[model samples]
Target: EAPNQALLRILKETEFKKIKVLGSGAFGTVYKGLWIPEGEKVKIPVAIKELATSPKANKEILDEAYVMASVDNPHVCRLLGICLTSTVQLIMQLMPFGCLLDYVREHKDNIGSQYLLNWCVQIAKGMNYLEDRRLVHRDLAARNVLVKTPQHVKITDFGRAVPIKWMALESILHRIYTHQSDVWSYGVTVWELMTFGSKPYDGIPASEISSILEKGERLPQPPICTIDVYMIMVKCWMIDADSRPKFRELIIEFSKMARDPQRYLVIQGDERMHLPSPTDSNFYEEDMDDVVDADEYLI
Candidate 1:
């Protein structure tokens, strides 16, 4: 059966008290509700996402369901069912831990800790799966990824996602969304995790970042970032979309680095406190060219 306004109205009217509002957005709203069939008592935390009825809204709503129906991974948020009436409503499983951005903000002191790294790796793996499916998440910032438990994180909000081929508007001189764009956004998300949820483009004017990003300016080295992860970020933010590695590749890259710390130049067994001596050589080595420390303004 389809999940639409009638079901939602019945669900809301009959179980409004049980359906606590979780979040709200442009499309409609999300509620933490229960799912009880004709005669059952299975009450789970359901995320009911409402959508307006319009040609565009209908397509977008259906697109979200279509994208989710085929994905079966723990890292990706699951769409349990849908009500397709006047105003469509999508019911999904819940993640109580909340968005990663909020978690980072609350635990800023824990940035760069091993637990954070593990969560990050998991997210990268999930996104990699999405990439493999040829879906481009146009919006890849931290807020869209939710942490269900210390060990489990899932990607959400496919409303903005579109096929890679349809992502750009060449007629309007707009670049379509691509796997690489997701990688670029993923790099930003990594920065958020490293900084314990700090917002990006902070302090630096948005205009500055927008111009630079549009002009092909990759994000500078992350604060307290390890050399290996930093390299991953570089690969993610390459100017050319084809140069960016796929999501599965990203998972392997991050996982391997996490397991073998040595792959990353920043993970010296012993943390050194002193700055290296200045060198006078004007020439630079390609292997060492990955040094992108700007010490400019903190993120």
Candidate 2:
């Protein structure tokens, strides 16, 4: 909501229908909505979070909407922008296939190494895009990662959630989640990929992890991983937060590994990733209803 009057597209209320309430709190509520982009032939499933008209709620909403709408990465969830209805609403793009954990775990028998390697690169690429934009996802993990297609997966859920075990030792001690802390979570997430969705740091207590991490212990290598790939995980777990490789560096390295499946992989020679092509009107404001509600919040 952090005052993105220029960058974000303002959607028409008629284009969105609140199917049902998803959740609610003192600040606002979320609704699962059906959004038809062109016409009735197809629809992009979306969710909308409306902010309560209060001082503190309005303050947070601006930054939240700005951050969500600014992201333009294939590996991250899409934000269709906001709609000013009875309340300020942030519209979220939804993935048809759900979480990466269940998708891979349930289908591993048929899924191949190519898909795994592709996911490894795609996930980092997504994170790299976010890193450059100056946002650190405090909570990043396989369970929160959603599958867009067999050739694609994306990160989601940047809410008030942080798991102790997935965080860097420094982040756990201090009250922060820096880009490096995100690096640590990325390491754990990468391990989850190789393990085909196994829970990270099994049998280790949360407090024990802080101690164990200090002693140079980390999650054991997954059965499917090679030394080249496993080193990426180990490097991300460095004790000194600044010592962890930045997301961009990982993307460069992972991209290399993916291209050379003597080490990593891709789906096939021709099943290339087809990113969503932006339409001319995608960035511009969608045509709005001529009549603004009397109570509608103004930009």
Candidate 3:
């Protein structure tokens, strides 16, 4: 009854002017819409995700809508309302800058380190809020994060996201999901931001990810990624989930990095090397990739 009520509220109140297809995947298609509220004078841009018309998918859509509606945070995209007509449609706030992956790819050459740091902080803040609520975003990644502007980002797309390459060892192995696993995904997301939308573990297949991680292999820090930030990523990849820092901890750490730009802006010489190989703890850190003397974020 509540879901039906929610559907009716949106159908009777808001008018949708479809702009174009925003995106499409296995779960559904997202369309950009000009959403005009019943009594509002102006139209607001919004995204409408239309789920496949099916019993199971419809249930998942309602579940996701409820989850999104439960949170009220600037860094978390708002679920405006829902429409269950021929298809289940979820109305959400429009992020002008599009998804983080595309945004980073388009503007990586132009954006500065300060802006990147703020983006990371905002996402961490949102995750911290979700952690407080004990919500596990099993599919945390750059692709699921939407960019509001050059300075802000919001996490989205939780309905159909499953355990894939972005998951932690526990998820990949035992299908156990918790906030700590989300931390691992956040680390991969950090690499995504640093590499301007490069896919995580580029050459490696998804099925091999857990195996490689089990062997203590982690993503090498991007050339432009600062050592302090990369250090956070390392912590996220710790073999034991308990070893990973909480989202609140990450929020504090990144917030501090944002405030003190000078310390994190420059990547140290030794930090340029790849993470120590799995074979030996004190063996050696090698520069497997060509090292950049002064990366884009350095200055």
- Candidate with the greatest TM-score versus the true structure: 3
Candidate 3 local lDDT, residue 272 = 32
Model 2 bad stretches (over 4 Å): 1-6, 18-33, 37-42, 48-63, 83-89, 159-161, 262-299
Q: What is the lDDT of residue 186 in candidate 2?
A: 90
Error of 1 at 179 (Å): 1.7
Residues forming the 10-long window of minimal summed lDDT in candidate 1: 163-172
> Candidate 3's residue-wise lDDT over 1-299, tens digit each?
13322232354323776778988998688887666555544455668888635788888888888777776677887677788687778888777678888887876656556666788888899889888767787888898898765566899865443546688888888898899999999988888887778987777778788779888888888887678888999999887899998888888888888887546655334233232222546431122232221111111
Q: Residues 1-299, candidate 1, lDDT per residue (tens digit)?
A: 43333111223334322357777777677776555443343344556778636888888877777666656667887666677568767767666668888877875543334455667678887787887666677877788888665556788875455222111222113655667777767877877676666655566654355455556655557656766677777676656677877777777777766675433423222233221112434322112322322111111
As a TM-score, model 2 comes out at 0.73
Where model 1 places Cα greater than 4 Å from the true spot, the runs are 1-17, 39-41, 51-59, 84-86, 110-112, 162-173, 203-217, 260-299
What tens digits encode model 2's per-residue C-alpha lDDT throughout 1-299? Answer: 37434367788888777777756887478776666544434445666888736666765776677666666677887567788765677887655456888877886665566566678788888888777767788888888787655666888765333498889887888867788889999999888877878888777777777778877888998766778888889999988888899888887787777676545532333244332222423321133334222112123
Clashing pairs in 3: none
Error of 3 at 71 (Å): 1.7
